[PDB]
Symmetry: D3
Subunit: 166 residues, 6 copies
C-alpha cells in the first residue's frame, strides 16, 4: 500500500477544512472554526492502486499560522486553495507557492491550484484568470465546491496523479 | 510508542463527534452532521508515555449505523456516551454495552461512562444515577462538555488509564 | 509473503491434531493426547503463492476448552472437523459453526466441513448427509484420513482457497 | 520481545521430540515417529523477560538427516541430547558438538548437555560421567524426563540463560 | 538502536573525506580525490547508547556540488569543516551555515565547527578566532587532524551529543 | 527493494578496496592502506530491479585478517579477486574458495573470479589459465581494472546475476 502525504494551503476562510472534511467524512462543514494544524488519514483506491492518504489541513489565518512551515516541509504534494469570491485569496497564491518552494527546497513540487466555493455567484476570479496562473506554474487548475462536492474528489485525486508524475 | 485504539459509542446527537473533535482539534462543532464512521489519530503524552491514539467516532443514528459492529470489534477501549439532557440516551447505554460485549466476546472490556453536555441546564440525568450505572459495570463515570472542554481530556485519558489496568 | 491464520475446531477425538500434524510434520499420531491450544507455522507454496500458514489446533474436550473462543476469534478461516464414525461429532458441527459466527461477528466466515477417519469402515455419517450440511452453510465438504493422508492437503489448501474468495 | 532460536540435536530415539513437545504442548508422546525437521514457536516469560522461543527439532536418524546442517546453522543455542540408557548416544555427543562448531564456525557456541529418560532405571551413563563431559565443553549438564517433566523447563530455560551470557 | 544522520560540509580540500574515513575505517587518506556525494554507515556505542551513524560526505568543490542541497536536507546534524591553514575556507563557513539553515528551514540546527589539519604549522586561523565564530552560532569549536586522529572521534561524537540536546 | 550482500575477498594488495571504491564512489584509490573490515551500501538499478548492495571489503593481509570468517559468513555472494601481475595471489584463490565453502557450509555458493589490474603489462596470469580455474569451480571469470574502470560494474553486477541463479 502506497502512502501519499498531501498538504492543503491557502488564505484563511477559503475552505481548506471544508474540502478536506468533505473528501474524508462526506459532509459539509457550514460553520467557520479557524484551523491550527489538523491531520486526516484514509485508505482509498485511486486508479486501481490501494493507498493511504495523509492529509494535512493547515492554518490560513496569520494568527494561527505558527510553525506552518514545519508542517508544509513534510508534504509530497500541495493543494493551493483560493476562493472564487475572494480576489485577495487568489492574489495570495503567489506567496503560498513561494513558501512551498522554500520548505521543499525545490522549484519542482507537485501542486494543484484549486478555486473553491464555485457554488457561489459573487465570483470575482474568472476561470480563465486562474487557468493562466496555473499554466504559469505548470500545474492544473480545478474548481471545487465543498458544499455540493463538485470537483472535490477530482482535486485531491489529481494531486495524487501529479505526485505520480514526479 | 504505544498505540491505543479508542472507540466512541452512544445514541445519535449526544456529542460523540464534538467530544472527539474538541480533544483532537481544540474547537467546538456547533452544527449537527450525523456521522457514519470517522477516524482520528494523534500523538500525545499521557502520564509520561508517548503514545498514538487512534479514535473511532461511530454512528449513533440507526440509519447511519450499518456495519458499526465491524468497527467496534477493533477497539481496545470504549467511551460510552450519553447526554445529561437526554434520558433516552442514558437508557440506551445498556444496549451499547451489550453490543461491546458481543463484538469483543468479553465481559471485561475497558470502558468509561461519559455524561456529555454538562454545560446545559435541562438536566434529566442526575450525577448519582449515572454513578450508580457505572458502578454496576465496574467503570468510572465522568461528565463532560464538548463546548467548554470540561472533562474532555479527563474522559479520554481515563479510558487510556483503564486500558492499562486490563 | 502472505499469511493465512487457520483454526481447526470440532469435537474431542475427531482427529484435529492428527490432521494438523500430518500436514505440517508428515507423520500419523496414533495415540490420543487431548489438546488444550497448540499452534503450528509452516511456509508453503499454494497455487504459486508463497505463504505462511499459522494453524491453531484447538481443544475439543469440554474439560480442556477454557478460552477456546479467545483463540477462535483470531482466525481467518476454520476447518470444522467431525469423524465419519462418530454421529455425535457430526451433530455437534452446528454448535461449532454458531461459535465461529459468534467470535467473528459475521455470518460470512471462510470454512470447510471435514469428515475425518475415512480410512475406517464403521461409517455412520454417509457422504451425502455431510454434503447436504455443507451445502446449507455454503461451504465445501471434504473427506480426510490423517492416517493415510487422503484429502489432508486438499482440506487445508481448500480452506486457503475459500479465504481468498472472501 | 526478544527471540531465541534453539536447536535440539542428538542421536535417533533419545527423546528430542518428546522433550520439545512436553515443553511446548504439555503432554508426553509415547510413540516413536522419527523426525525430519520440525519447528515450534511459543511466547514465554523467562526471568521476567517476555520472549519468543523458536525451537528446531532435528532428525537423529541418519536416514532422515538430509540437510540437518542447513537447519543447525541458524541456531543461537543447542540442546545436545543423549539418553541415560543409551551409551552409544552419549558417545555420539562428540560428533554433534563437532557439527555444531562446524555450522556456526565458532568454538564458543551456547550449549547445554541433556541426559534424557531419567525416569528409566536401565542407566548405563552415570551422572558423574556426563558432568565430566559437560565440564570439558564448559557447559551445564542437566538430566530430564520428557515423561514426568523432570528437568524439562530447566533444560530449555538454562539454554536461554547460556545464550544470554554469550 | 538509535540512528543519527550526520552531514559533513565545507570547502573543497579541507579534509571532510579524510575525517570521515579516519572515523569509519581507521586510516588516513593521503591523496586528494574530490567527492561528489558519498555515504558511510557504522554501528558504534556513544555514551552507552548503541547507535547507527549514517554519515554523508559532501562535495566542497563547486564543480562537484550539484544537488548538494538535496543531500544536506536529510541531515540531523552538520559538521562544518574548515582547514586551519586555509583562511578562505574559514571565511566560507558563513555560507555553509546559511545553506544549512535554508535546507532545514530552521535557525536551530545541531552543528559543530571543526578546524581540521591541526597537525600542520602554516596556521592562518588562530583558535580564538574560530572559538569566536562558533560562539556567535551557539555551537562548539573543535580542532582535528585526520592524519594523526587528534579530535576526530571527539568531533563526531560531540555532534551526536548536540543532536541529543535538540 | 531487494538487498544483495556481496563480499570481496583475496590476497593483500590485489585491489579489493580499489574495486569497491571505484564501483561505489567513482574514483581510483592510488595509495595502499591495508583494510581490516569495511562496508559500503548503495542503491542501484540492476537489470531493471531497484536494489540495495551491501558490500563487505575484507582484509587480505594475514596480519589484519582477524575474524574475517565471521564477516564472510554473512555474505550471499563472493568476488574472489587476484591480480594478473601476482601469480601467488592466483594460487591463493583455492584457499579463499575453501574458506568460503567453510563459512557458508555449502559447495554451492555464488562466486565470480576476478583478475584485477588488467591495465598493467607485467602479466603473469594469462586469461586462459584463469578461465580454466573458474570453469573448474563452475563460475565466471572477469578481468577488471580499478584504475580505468574496465570490467568493474560487470564484475559486481555479474555476481548479483549469479546470486539470482541460486
Ligand atoms: N458556499 C460555500 N461555502 C464554503 C465552501 N467551502 C467552505 N465554505 C465556508 O467557508 C467558511 C470557511 O471554511 P473553512 O473550510 O473553515 O476555511 P479554511 O480555509 O479551512 N479556514 P482556516 O484557514 O482559518 O482554517 C465556512 O463557513 C464554510 O462553510 C464552499 O465550497 N462553498
Ligand atoms: N451545549 C452542548 N452542545 C453539544 C455538546 N456536545 C455536542 N453538542 C451539540 O450536539 C449536537 C450533536 O453533536 P454531535 O457531536 O454531532 O453528536 P454525535 O453524537 O456525534 N451524533 P451522531 O451519532 O449522529 O454522529 C451538535 O449540535 C453539537 O454542537 C456539549 O457538550 N454541549
Ligand atoms: N484411523 C484413524 N484414526 C485417526 C484419524 N485421525 C485421528 N485418529 C485417531 O483418533 C485419536 C484422536 O486423534 P486426535 O487427533 O488426538 O483428536 P483431536 O480431535 O485432536 N482431540 P482433542 O479435541 O481432544 O484434542 C487418535 O488415537 C488418532 O490416532 C484418522 O484419520 N484415522
Ligand atoms: N521413558 C521415557 N521414554 C521417553 C522419554 N523421551 C522419549 N521417550 C520415548 O522414546 C521414544 C523416542 O522419542 P522421540 O522423542 O521420538 O525421539 P527423537 O530423539 O525425537 N527421535 P528422532 O531423532 O528419530 O526424531 C518414544 O517412544 C518416546 O516416548 C523419556 O524421558 N522417558
Ligand atoms: N596534513 C593533513 N592533511 C590532511 C588532513 N585532512 C585532509 N588532508 C589532506 O587534504 C587533502 C584533501 O582531503 P580530502 O579529505 O579529500 O578533502 P575534502 O574536504 O573531502 N575535499 P572535497 O570537498 O573536494 O571532497 C588530501 O590530500 C588529504 O590527505 C589533515 O588533518 N592533515
Ligand atoms: N594499476 C592498478 N593498480 C591498482 C588496481 N587496483 C588496485 N591497485 C593498486 O594496488 C594497491 C592495493 O590496492 P588495494 O585496493 O588497497 O588492495 P586490497 O586488495 O584492498 N589490499 P588489502 O587486502 O590489504 O586491504 C593500491 O596502490 C592501488 O592503487 C588496478 O586495477 N590497477
Ligand atoms: Ca453541516
Ligand atoms: Ca528551505
Ligand atoms: Ca464552532
Ligand atoms: Ca505414529
Ligand atoms: Ca461476538
Ligand atoms: Ca501420550
Ligand atoms: Ca562452517
Ligand atoms: Ca594512507
Ligand atoms: Ca586517486
Ligand atoms: Mg481550516
Ligand atoms: Mg475582474
Ligand atoms: Mg457524530
Ligand atoms: Mg429523574
Ligand atoms: Mg487435539
Ligand atoms: Mg444413517
Ligand atoms: Mg524426533
Ligand atoms: Mg559404566
Ligand atoms: Mg571529499
Ligand atoms: Mg591573522
Ligand atoms: Mg583493502
Ligand atoms: Mg606462465
Amino acid at each position: 500500500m502506497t502512502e501519499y502525504k498531501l498538504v492543503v494551503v491557502g488564505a484563511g476562510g477559503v475552505g481548506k477544512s471544508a474540502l478536506t472534511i468533505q473528501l474524508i467524512q462526506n459532509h459539509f462543514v457550514d460553520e467557520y472554526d479557524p484551523t491550527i494544524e489538523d491531520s486526516y488519514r484514509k485508505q482509498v483506491v485511486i486508479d486501481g492502486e490501494t493507498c493511504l492518504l495523509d492529509i494535512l489541513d493547515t492554518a490560513g489565518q496569520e494568527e494561527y499560522s505558527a510553525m506552518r512551515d514545519e508542517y508544509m516541509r513534510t508534504g509530497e504534494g500541495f493543494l493551493c486553495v483560493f476562493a472564487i469570491n475572494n480576489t485577495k485569496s487568489f492574489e495570495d497564491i503567489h506567496q503560498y507557492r513561494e513558501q512551498i518552494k522554500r520548505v521543499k527546497d525545490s522549484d519542482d513540487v507537485p501542486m494543484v491550484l484549486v478555486g473553491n466555493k464555485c457554488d457561489l455567484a459573487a465570483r470575482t476570479v474568472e476561470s480563465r484568470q486562474a487557468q493562466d496562473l496555473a499554466r504559469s506554474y505548470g500545474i492544473p487548475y480545478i474548481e471545487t465546491s465543498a458544499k455540493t462536492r463538485q470537483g472535490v474528489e477530482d482535486a485531491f485525486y489529481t494531486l495524487v496523479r501529479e505526485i505520480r508524475q514526479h
